[PDB]
Design an enzyme around this catalytic site. Sequence first.
Site, PDB file in Angstrom:
ATOM      1  N   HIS A 197       0.893  -1.197   0.039  1.00  0.00           N
ATOM      2  CA  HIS A 197       0.014  -0.030  -0.018  1.00  0.00           C
ATOM      3  C   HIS A 197       0.687   1.334  -0.064  1.00  0.00           C
ATOM      4  O   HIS A 197       0.399   2.248  -0.491  1.00  0.00           O
ATOM      5  CB  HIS A 197      -0.936  -0.012   1.410  1.00  0.00           C
ATOM      6  CG  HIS A 197      -2.209   0.844   1.041  1.00  0.00           C
ATOM      7  ND1 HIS A 197      -3.231   0.773   0.070  1.00  0.00           N
ATOM      8  CD2 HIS A 197      -2.597   2.007   1.932  1.00  0.00           C
ATOM      9  CE1 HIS A 197      -4.178   1.445   0.422  1.00  0.00           C
ATOM     10  NE2 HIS A 197      -3.716   2.336   1.476  1.00  0.00           N
TER      11      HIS A 197
ATOM     12  N   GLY B  67      -1.036   5.149  11.137  1.00  0.00           N
ATOM     13  CA  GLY B  67       0.411   5.202  11.262  1.00  0.00           C
ATOM     14  C   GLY B  67       1.189   3.824  11.471  1.00  0.00           C
ATOM     15  O   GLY B  67       2.406   3.626  11.409  1.00  0.00           O
TER      16      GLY B  67
ATOM     17  N   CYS C 273       0.379   0.835  10.207  1.00  0.00           N
ATOM     18  CA  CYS C 273       0.303   0.151   8.992  1.00  0.00           C
ATOM     19  C   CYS C 273       1.957  -0.360   9.067  1.00  0.00           C
ATOM     20  O   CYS C 273       2.900   0.359   8.877  1.00  0.00           O
ATOM     21  CB  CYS C 273       0.382   0.760   7.886  1.00  0.00           C
ATOM     22  SG  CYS C 273      -0.082  -0.342   6.337  1.00  0.00           S
TER      23      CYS C 273
HETATM   24  C1  LIG Z   1      -0.494  11.252   4.028  1.00  0.00           C
HETATM   25  C2  LIG Z   1       0.438  10.176   4.364  1.00  0.00           C
HETATM   26  C3  LIG Z   1       1.405  10.586   5.688  1.00  0.00           C
HETATM   27  N1  LIG Z   1      -0.160   8.708   4.592  1.00  0.00           N
HETATM   28  C4  LIG Z   1      -1.431   8.701   5.014  1.00  0.00           C
HETATM   29  C5  LIG Z   1      -1.443   7.300   4.782  1.00  0.00           C
HETATM   30  C6  LIG Z   1      -2.628   6.429   5.091  1.00  0.00           C
HETATM   31  C7  LIG Z   1      -2.485   5.121   5.170  1.00  0.00           C
HETATM   32  N2  LIG Z   1      -3.535   4.328   5.463  1.00  0.00           N
HETATM   33  C8  LIG Z   1      -3.655   3.505   6.802  1.00  0.00           C
HETATM   34  C9  LIG Z   1      -2.533   3.906   7.658  1.00  0.00           C
HETATM   35  C10 LIG Z   1      -2.677   2.840   8.783  1.00  0.00           C
HETATM   36  O1  LIG Z   1      -1.995   3.149   9.734  1.00  0.00           O
HETATM   37  N3  LIG Z   1      -3.678   2.085   8.968  1.00  0.00           N
HETATM   38  C11 LIG Z   1      -3.747   1.209  10.177  1.00  0.00           C
HETATM   39  C12 LIG Z   1      -4.651   1.641  11.173  1.00  0.00           C
HETATM   40  N4  LIG Z   1      -4.854   0.783  12.107  1.00  0.00           N
HETATM   41  C13 LIG Z   1      -5.527   1.402  13.193  1.00  0.00           C
HETATM   42  N5  LIG Z   1      -5.958   2.902  12.544  1.00  0.00           N
HETATM   43  C14 LIG Z   1      -6.915   3.812  13.064  1.00  0.00           C
HETATM   44  N6  LIG Z   1      -5.253   2.748  11.370  1.00  0.00           N
HETATM   45  C15 LIG Z   1      -4.652   1.993   7.946  1.00  0.00           C
HETATM   46  O2  LIG Z   1      -5.450   1.179   8.058  1.00  0.00           O
HETATM   47  N7  LIG Z   1      -4.622   2.694   6.921  1.00  0.00           N
HETATM   48  C16 LIG Z   1      -5.714   2.457   5.768  1.00  0.00           C
HETATM   49  C17 LIG Z   1      -5.166   1.242   4.990  1.00  0.00           C
HETATM   50  C18 LIG Z   1      -3.906   0.877   4.830  1.00  0.00           C
HETATM   51  C19 LIG Z   1      -3.893  -0.475   3.903  1.00  0.00           C
HETATM   52  F1  LIG Z   1      -2.822  -0.846   3.939  1.00  0.00           F
HETATM   53  C20 LIG Z   1      -4.596  -0.808   3.348  1.00  0.00           C
HETATM   54  F2  LIG Z   1      -4.571  -1.707   2.253  1.00  0.00           F
HETATM   55  C21 LIG Z   1      -5.929  -0.192   3.012  1.00  0.00           C
HETATM   56  C22 LIG Z   1      -6.299   0.901   4.025  1.00  0.00           C
HETATM   57  F3  LIG Z   1      -7.470   1.413   3.865  1.00  0.00           F
HETATM   58  C23 LIG Z   1      -1.112   4.573   4.988  1.00  0.00           C
HETATM   59 CL1  LIG Z   1      -0.886   2.730   5.055  1.00  0.00          CL
HETATM   60  C24 LIG Z   1       0.103   5.498   4.725  1.00  0.00           C
HETATM   61  C25 LIG Z   1      -0.283   6.605   4.777  1.00  0.00           C
HETATM   62  N8  LIG Z   1       0.802   7.983   4.516  1.00  0.00           N
END
Ligand code: A1D87
Lengths: 302, 302
Positions: free
Chosen positions: A41, A143, A145
């Site tokens: 991702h 964050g 991930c």
């Molecule tokens: C602008 C820059 C800085 N940026 C934004 C990003 C958004 C991303 N998306 C996710 C990050 C993440 O940490 N998590 C795990 C999680 N656990 C509990 N919470 C609440 N969040 C996510 O679920 N996502 C969404 C997500 C990740 C996937 F790998 C996927 F296949 C589908 C998703 F919807 C990420 Cl990974 C990086 C970002 N960088």
Amino acid sequence: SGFRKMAFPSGKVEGCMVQVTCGTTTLNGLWLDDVVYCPRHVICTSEDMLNPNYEDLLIRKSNHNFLVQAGNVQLRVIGHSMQNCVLKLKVDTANPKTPKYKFVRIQPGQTFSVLACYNGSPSGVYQCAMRPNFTIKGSFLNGSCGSVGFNIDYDCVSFCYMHHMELPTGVHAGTDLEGNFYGPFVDRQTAQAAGTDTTITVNVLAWLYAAVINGDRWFLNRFTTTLNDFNLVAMKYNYEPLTQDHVDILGPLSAQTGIAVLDMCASLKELLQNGMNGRTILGSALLEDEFTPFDVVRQCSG
Amino acid sequence: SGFRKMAFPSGKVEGCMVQVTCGTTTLNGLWLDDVVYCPRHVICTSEDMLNPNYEDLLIRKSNHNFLVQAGNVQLRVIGHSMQNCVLKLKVDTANPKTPKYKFVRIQPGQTFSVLACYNGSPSGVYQCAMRPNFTIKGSFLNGSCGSVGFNIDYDCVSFCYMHHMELPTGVHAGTDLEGNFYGPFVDRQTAQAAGTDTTITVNVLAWLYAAVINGDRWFLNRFTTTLNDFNLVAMKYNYEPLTQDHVDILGPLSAQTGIAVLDMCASLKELLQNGMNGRTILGSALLEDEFTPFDVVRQCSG
Ligand SMILES: CC(C)n1cc2cc(Nc3cc(=O)n(Cc4ncn(C)n4)c(=O)n3Cc3cc(F)c(F)cc3F)c(Cl)cc2n1
Ligand SMILES: CC(C)n1cc2cc(Nc3cc(=O)n(Cc4ncn(C)n4)c(=O)n3Cc3cc(F)c(F)cc3F)c(Cl)cc2n1
């Protein structure tokens, strides 16, 4: 009770966490020997995240688009490939802190330690179990991930989980380290529901054995059952059926207490059918289902 | 986005654990710079442990009576002293893995991570709290003596607990790193009871805020209370008083959720008077009191 969710010491894994960034998209990666593993991702822009074409996205990336950092120290990327939903970045430096390691795919019910990380920096460690619906009830913020889950046996870290996403109900979904999702989920930013969960029967039985070891044994009855009859009843109460492997991993607890596995099954069947009628087990009216038979032996006998 | 008992990553502490042996008596030590810290109980033979005179026992020892092992390496002891219940062994080599660190004495209700160790080898990590009666409800087996409890702030490890003993009730007692016990205990193998324990009120409230943050709200009500009237009821139920300082430190969580602190107190008051009538909060059937307000803020916001 005298049982805690205990994690493995995290140091062997802490030494492997890095940050991976592609453009502004950033997440955690795992640095073992000269390879960094992370969720693919990372190659998505905000506009790609909903319905990514990962082959096309990867084709347009080169080694120089990937920023891998160990703390503030950049690791130069010299190769890249994708295996299922994991990106593999070859770097020019073998991690001197690489432990002995294995990649494993776990079954529902199995427990593991999670090292929650943000921007490549470990923040916390806790134990959790793979649910029968292939989610984990973790604790993860945005964050996280790329955070990994693991066990340590002998002197070898068995990596079993890499965190990808939160589902609408607040539970978590991810892959093994070969990039295969646990469960029917996909790595796209769309709402995906987990199926209805069930109770992990083999772990409830481990908990009853733990109670017996500690002298709390009011629920032992004068009956037995067959495995097949027990399974048919269990499923009527939203309990998982037992496998032959489950019977086997209960072996040591059965030997320690002298209570045959199928006698414990008969005891649990009576509790399912009749309820606890106001009684407690190890001080609780709830049956714990996130301690495995190995967890119980570790905490009772070391 | 989930709520778990989460420990600090243990790697900074793992690198400091050693085994200390005197005669056949053996336990865990903490190697920081060129000093090894461990419970002075290690200088006791089997017969000494029942009623030791430690100053006598220590004057009868030389540097060469102490065997310190760091993995497969033996550290040569070149000096020894006692500070209260802690033995300090000067060794001829500094630990290159020494983190930045401080020794601190914690207050009842404060939480810390434990690295349970056996024969100098880290075995597990978990979070616990210092009880109002100065015990800890740990997970410790024979051979865990000398395991340490700690917090990590930025890059600095604050060591607050060194494990000594298990009491007959199965709870645990230990010292700070200056060798002073928490509570009325002594380092003698003799049966010791603790004072009556109470529930850590500020922590319960913090955990109720965690529940609301995570969407579990059934227990909220619209009663209000004064701080004094809440405290009268708390004290009736063997709950610790809530101070104005406690109210202030809950401020961030109040602001986040929009639930005034005294409105949460009114909710807690009702739970004490009515019980949870078979319901759970964050999956728990009882009121959890081993999460501090800071713990909740860190896990729910970063
Ligand atoms: C602008 C820059 C800085 N940026 C934004 C990003 C958004 C991303 N998306 C996710 C990050 C993440 O940490 N998590 C795990 C999680 N656990 C509990 N919470 C609440 N969040 C996510 O679920 N996502 C969404 C997500 C990740 C996937 F790998 C996927 F296949 C589908 C998703 F919807 C990420 Cl990974 C990086 C970002 N960088
Ligand atoms: C190799 C042979 C010669 N040897 C025997 C020893 C016995 C010792 N005594 C203790 C060790 C210990 O790990 N714990 C902590 C604990 N946590 C939960 N459990 C169940 N046990 C203890 O409570 N004790 C007893 C104890 C320790 C004290 F520090 C103390 F001041 C009074 C005590 F009764 C030790 Cl430390 C070394 C031994 N070596």
